[PDB]
Structure formats: C-alpha cells, structure tokens
Design a protein around this ligand. Structure first.
Ligand code: D03
Length: 180
C-alpha cells in the first residue's frame, strides 16, 4: 500500500526512459546529474532520455574491491536540470524485505508496478557468464524489458533490476557509498 505510493512518487520524480544501442531501459536519477543504469545498457557517448539526445560526460562501470562486477553503470549527464537528491533512500548495505515493488518505465512497460514479494540477499550470481555480487533476489518471473526497473519498499530504494532466469529476478543493490 505505502510501498506502491512510495514507488509511484519516486518514479514520477526521479525516473526516465532511456535508449542506448543495446535497448530501452528504465533509468533512475540519483542526485545532481548522476543517474544509474544496468551495466549491460552500455551507454555510449550519447543516450536518448525521454526521446531527447543527452551527452554522457562520464560513465563508471562499478566493481567491488576485487574487480568483481556489480552490474551498475553510473552516468553523469550533460543537462541543466538536477535530479532530486535520493541518496537518503539508499541503504549502506543490502536490504532484505518481506514485500517489495518493482517499478518499470519504458515505452513497452510504461508506468507498471509489480509486487514481487520477498527480497533476499542472494549475493553471488553468475549472470550471463559474469560473476556478479551484491544481488538481491525475488521470485517473480521477470522478463525482457524490465531491466533498469527500480526495486523499492516503503521509504527505501533497494536496487535496480538487472537480470532474471525466467523464474527469479535479480537486482543490483543500490548502496549509498557508490554516490559519495
Ligand atoms: C534485461 O537486460 C532487459 O530486460 N533487457 C531489455 C531487453 C528487451 C527485449 C529483448 C531483450 C532484452 C534482462 C532482464 C532479464 C531477461 C529475462 N528476465 C529478466 O529479468 N537482463 C538480461 O538479459 C541479462 C543481460 C546481462 C546481464 C549481465 C551482463 C551482461 C548482460 N542477462 C540475464 O539476465 C541472464 C541470465 C542467465 C541466467 C541463467 C543462465 C544463463 C543466463
């Protein structure tokens, strides 16, 4: 109930639809001109954000202290408007919750919300041939076009949807320290 209300407002204020050469994704703006996509979106020097061409000043593919994939890319966008600052909604470590909502904002899934149920710290996953850490898992059959979806509970932005095996979905935990 509260989590859906939270999700809808978060998506209205901070999310957008992006197209790269690799597809269409939900994008979440974090603060200032820094946003996040799934790594596999592979943003080039320009992206389409709500159909408008926007320059990418800088792009950072995140890894842990061993070089292990986190499956997030951080993007600094060449634009006047600043994102509302949502770092206070990001945890310091992986959040487990009993009820979460996954929010999608593309041309395909416009303004769609999915109650995924329980979110568990899955940790390690071999994600399409790549060893990947800090995965959050939910037992909903997510499908192609949901990448970049934003995983939320009431007052919490938990992670970004980056993959699925047809039966379970996985989110990269969105941690506060990535945005210091
Ligand atoms: C998203 O990337 C996605 O929704 N992409 C847009 C898209 C639209 C149309 C066609 C194809 C893609 C995708 C979400 C998955 C797909 C099935 N269910 C989901 O929730 N994610 C992937 O395709 C990722 C891509 C990837 C991740 C990391 C590095 C490089 C690429 N791959 C997987 O989820 C693979 C999973 C897997 C599981 C078991 C065994 C082998 C592979």
């Amino acid at each position: 109930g509260p989590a859906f209300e939270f999700a809808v407002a978060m998506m209205k204020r901070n999310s957008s639809t992006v197209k790269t050469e690799y597809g269409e994704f939900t994008m979440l703006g974090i603060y200032d001109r820094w946003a996040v996509l799934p790594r596999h979106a592979k943003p080039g020097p320009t992206i389409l954000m709500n159909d408008q061409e926007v320059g990418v000043l800088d792009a950072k593919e995140l890894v842990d202290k061993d070089g292990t994939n986190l499956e997030l890319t951080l993007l600094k966008l060449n634009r006047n408007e600043k994102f509302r600052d949502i770092r206070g909604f990001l945890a310091k470590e992986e959040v487990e919750v009993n009820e979460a909502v996954l929010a999608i904002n593309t041309s395909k899934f416009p303004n769609m919300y999915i109650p995924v149920g329980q979110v568990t710290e899955y940790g390690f996953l071999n994600l399409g041939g790549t060893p990947t850490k800090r995965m959050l898992m939910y037992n909903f059959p997510t499908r192609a076009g949901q990448c970049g979806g934003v995983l939320m509970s009431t007052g919490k932005v938990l992670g970004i949807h980056v993959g699925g095996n047809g039966h379970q979905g996985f989110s990269a935990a969105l941690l506060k320290h990535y945005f210091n």
